[PDB]
């Protein structure tokens, strides 16, 4: 019985198997854009993945998961809230069944079709498993997806899924930019929370950009076909892999704009 996103296994469920669940620091949240306050302390963002090496791409029976190699300062995050350097290890999405929700954060309520999580670890920490033991491990940038024109740049992603249809199916997924998924703007709101999955530990600096990316209908429609289930097993399609927003309790969101 582990977790997911069903009536008996789904968010609701899971602070059971992890009391943090109900913790002080949980993700995602609303973001309710005008009690955010703009900070002039933040330092401008830098998004730097131009030598970013991507390797793999896995259905883990919860998303898929496009990932890095981060054995060296390649793709990295860097200022806005940040001290110091996070390095990109990986990638994924949380999306809906219907075009009207999927996004894990909100903006003044809304849900958009889709969200991008970006994840990166904080190099003074030495590798992801000793930094999502500390409270400043890791930065996770999160792009909204809205449904209209086609993103050229996500389309790769979209022709591989299908030879990873099923849970723990995996393949070769070299050469990616990641550049290709951005918004033109790095305008953003930022909040300390927390893993939006099992084990939803609280070690997220999040970065959530203002600015959605549009995709095509056909696009999440591909990831629409994908499965939690293994292969051979009855077909559960992978939709609806979003948590929903928790109580903020004592933070603040901060806006660079
Ligand atoms: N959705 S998320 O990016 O907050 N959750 C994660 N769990 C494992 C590392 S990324
Ligand atoms: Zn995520």
Known sequence: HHWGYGKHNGPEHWHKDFPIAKGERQSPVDIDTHTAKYDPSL???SVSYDQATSL??????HAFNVEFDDSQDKAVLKGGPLDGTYRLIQFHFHWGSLDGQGSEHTVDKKKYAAELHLVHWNTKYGDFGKAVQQPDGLAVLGIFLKVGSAKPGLQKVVDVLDSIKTKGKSADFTNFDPRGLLPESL???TYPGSLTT???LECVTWIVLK??????????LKFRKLNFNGEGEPEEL????????????????????
């Open 187 to 189: 305008d953003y709101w």
């Open 43 to 45: 330092k401008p963002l």
């Open 211 to 220: 600015e959605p990316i549009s995709v095509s209908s056909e696009q999440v």
């Open 198 to 200: 099992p084990p939803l």
């Open 238 to 257: 992978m939709v609806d892999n979003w948590r929903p927003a928790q109580p903020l309790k004592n933070r603040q969101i901060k806006a660079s704009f």
């Open 56 to 61: 793999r791409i896995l259905n883990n029976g």
